[PDB]
Amino acid sequence: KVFGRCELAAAMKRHGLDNYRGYSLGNWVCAAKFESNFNTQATNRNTDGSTDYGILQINSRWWCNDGRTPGSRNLCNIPCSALLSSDITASVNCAKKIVSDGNGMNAWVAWRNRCKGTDVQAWIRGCRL
Ligand SMILES: [Cl-]
Structure with a gap:
């Protein structure tokens, strides 16, 4: 799913990201724009062999399991493919x-x-939030 700007803002707000740890909603929307162009299916491979997944480009080196990053951690306790869903819950x-x-x-x-x-x-x- 490729989110619209305000559509993503409203989804993030609903999931509790607005001012989470002091970061206003605009920070999260800006990050997603430049990380993934609002596309939940974005993937990018890093030089070390790890891969970044989803709308916030979460790295398999530390945060998720993709079965192909040896010696990595899975701190979020999820398969990396869960981060590519049209439902942003796992990524958030x-x-x-x-x-x-x-x-x-x-x-x-x-x-x-x-x-x-x-x-x-x-x-x-301009977003209805
Ligand atoms: Cl901080």
Whole structure:
């Protein structure tokens, strides 16, 4: 599923991401835009052989099991394919664990490089929330 901008914002808000650990909703929508272009089916392979999955590009090196990243962890306790669902519940619940781990949203490279320190409220402007 390729989300619309406001559609995703409303889904994220419903799942408790707005101001989660101090990160306003705009931060999450911006991250998803630049990580996956709002596409739940996005995958990208990393140099180390791990793979990033889904709308928030969660990495199989630490967070999910894909059966092909030897010596990796599965901290969210889910198969990586669960992160590709049109239902964002699994991605959100795992993201909540990631952002709580001490490094905040800096875990997401595209957030650090393209959202951090910008006017992120622009990403939810005009949305019925
Ligand atoms: Cl933080």
